[PDB]
Amino acid sequence: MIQRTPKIQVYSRHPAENGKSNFLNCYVSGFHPSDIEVDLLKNGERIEKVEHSDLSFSKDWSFYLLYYTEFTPTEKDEYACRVNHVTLSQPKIVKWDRNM
């Protein structure tokens, strides 16, 4: 058996073909086993509509998830990624740095 804690990155991107749109991304990387729970949060509340959830693996024991959706941030709103995994005794919450 092998288990690996995910690395978690939270960041925003504008698609270059449509630069006015903005996407909030979580990249949850290098984890094993593949069982996982991942949410985007807005002011502590789970975002129910997340448009994209893309899972892949490299080696048979390394999984990668890109979880992202369109959003319109304002400076009053706080966003975060919340991940649960067997390697994490408590849910891990990674705040979005608004300059990233």
Numbering used by the authors: 0 to 99
Please share text taken word for word from the publication where this structure appeared.
Beta-2 microglobulin (β2m) is a 99-residue protein, physiologically acting as the light chain of the major histocompatibility complex (MHC) class I. β2m displays a classic immunoglobulin fold, and is well conserved among vertebrates. The characterization of β2m structure and folding dynamics gained considerable resonance when the protein was found to be responsible for Dialysis Related Amyloidosis (DRA). The mutant protein is the etiological agent of a previously unknown systemic amyloidosis, whereby patients carrying the D76N mutation accumulate large mutant β2m amyloid deposits, especially in internal organs.
Conversely, D96 and D98 fall in a negatively charged region, clustering with E74 and E77. Moreover, the electron density of the EF-loop is weak between residues 75–76, suggesting transmission of conformational flexibility from the C-terminus to the EF-loop region. None of the variants showed a marked Tm variation (relative to wt β2m), however some features are worth noting. Both D96N and D98N mutants melt with a Tm 1.3°C higher than wt β2m. Even if the D98N structure is well superimposable with that of wt β2m, the D98N mutant displays local increased flexibility in the C-terminus and the neighbouring EF-loop; such flexibility is somewhat unexpectedly mirrored by a slightly increased fold stability (ΔTm + 1.3°C). Differences of roughly 1 or more standard deviations with respect to the wt structure can be observed only in the in the DE-loop of the D53N mutant, and in the EF-loop of D59N and D98N.
